[PDB]
Amino acid sequence: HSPILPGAWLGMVGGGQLGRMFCFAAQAMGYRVAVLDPDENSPAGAVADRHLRAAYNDEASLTELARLCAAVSTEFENVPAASLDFLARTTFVSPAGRCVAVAQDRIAEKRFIASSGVTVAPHVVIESSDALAALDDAKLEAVLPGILKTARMGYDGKGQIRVRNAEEVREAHASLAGVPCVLEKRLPLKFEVSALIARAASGASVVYPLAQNTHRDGVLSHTIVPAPDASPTLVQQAQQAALQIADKLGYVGVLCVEFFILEDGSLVANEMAPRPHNSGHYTVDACATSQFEQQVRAMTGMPLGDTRQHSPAVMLNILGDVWFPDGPKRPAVTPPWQEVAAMPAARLHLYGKEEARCGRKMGHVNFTAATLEEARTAARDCARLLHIIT
Ligand SMILES: Nc1ncnc2c1ncn2[C@@H]1O[C@H](COP(=O)(O)OP(=O)(O)OP(=O)(O)O)[C@@H](O)[C@H]1O
Numbered sequence: 001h002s003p004i005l006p007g008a009w010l011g012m013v014g015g016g017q018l019g020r021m022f023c024f025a026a027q028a029m030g031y032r033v034a035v036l037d038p039d040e041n042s043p044a045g046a047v048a049d050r051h052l053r054a055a056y057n058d059e060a061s062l063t064e065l066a067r068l069c070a071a072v073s074t075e076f077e078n079v080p081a082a083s084l085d086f087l088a089r090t091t092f093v094s095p096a097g098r099c100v101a102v103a104q105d106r107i108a109e110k111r112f113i114a115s116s117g118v119t120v121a122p123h124v125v126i127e128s129s130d131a132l133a134a135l136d137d138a139k140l141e142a143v144l145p146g147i148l149k150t151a152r153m154g155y156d157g158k159g160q161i162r163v164r165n166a167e168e169v170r171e172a173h174a175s176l177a178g179v180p181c182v183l184e185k186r187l188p189l190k191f192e193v194s195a196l197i198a199r200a201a202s203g204a205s206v207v208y209p210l211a212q213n214t215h216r217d218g219v220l221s222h223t224i225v226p227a228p229d230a231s232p233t234l235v236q237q238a239q240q241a242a243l244q245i246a247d248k249l250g251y252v253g254v255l256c257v258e259f260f261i262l263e264d265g266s267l268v269a270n271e272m273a274p275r276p277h278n279s280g281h282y283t284v285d286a287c288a289t290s291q292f293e294q295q296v297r298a299m300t301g302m303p304l305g306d307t308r309q310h311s312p313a314v315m316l317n318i319l320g321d322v323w324f325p326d327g328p329k330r331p332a333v334t335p336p337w338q339e340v341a342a343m344p345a346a347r348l349h350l351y352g353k354e355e356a357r358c359g360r361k362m363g364h365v366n367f368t369a370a371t372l373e374e375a376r377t378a379a380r381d382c383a384r385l386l387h388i389i390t
């Protein structure tokens, strides 16, 4: 792969905030970015050098994108893998459709991660309604109480149903329209972390520090880096697990692997995203090379960047709920951005979305400081200010 050098066109399938941040990283290095996204008001399409407003399966637009761009990547884990393979007919596509197909499918994902030598949650695969009917109650009960999760198309905790007994499993599967699912045992979690790596076509790789992640209602709330409760041994183990997965997958791009640390201290892989990840947004303000710049470098065959963290960091997600301090049934209130910007540690990132809605990711604030405790205090003060915490 002769390197694709600055000045070239790079393609981005998906136009959310991840694609928008990719644009800034690519444009700062002198690349031009074409974003393919069906939405008029796409956050990435808004800043891209070119916006192809098209469905992800539109043949003419994929052909146009691959003709224009020397390399293409994605910011959308649920993108059709067949679209990436169609693009790969005429341009370089990083990560490959086959890699995305594994990562986007919980059944394939658990099988692949386990096959890499990495522990996953105890679970039962439910391939179909007919297959579930053939499973006896005891087989389900071994992983109960648990969570029934659709194998495809889930995000932000959607497509997941809590289940406490076999009858609830069968009713839940009908409630999910019978799609392939994984039934996972609910595990006693002590904390959650994510490993963030980038891998080049050559097999060279880089690793970020471990991120410690807190979720609210299944949605990422904040990230603390370096993970304060992860020993150097656990950090190395989680990084090595992510690199082993990426190596076996032949992955080229940025990969994020989420893990649980259980109350007994064991490390359990949860899932992986074939793309930059919300838990990696801190790298923009805290590390020499951001995850978005690694995505540029991997897809162009350029050398991977240094991951040095120059500053401890906390990322706080900003959901649309912040706009409804008097509840969702009452008028929106513009958040107090002037008071956020008055905090020395605060790095405000707003995605340009017009309509605040509850559950919608509207931006994030990174807090960097000389010490982690100062960044954490600042993130806590801002969370109270925004009514994220009491
Ligand atoms: N087996 C489990 N045991 C305990 N908690 C779990 C389990 N599976 C998921 N959770 C909790 O639910 C959160 C969301 O689950 P999961 O990662 O499967 O959903 P998602 O929609 O794919 O994720 P994301 O929030 O990254 O889009 C996990 O971070 C964890 O807090």
Ligand SMILES: [Mg+2]
Pocket (backbone or CB within 6 Å): 077, 103, 104, 105, 109, 271, 272, 273, 274
């Ligand atoms: Mg996944």
Ligand SMILES: [Mg+2]
Pocket (backbone or CB within 6 Å): 258, 270, 271
């Ligand atoms: Mg997750």
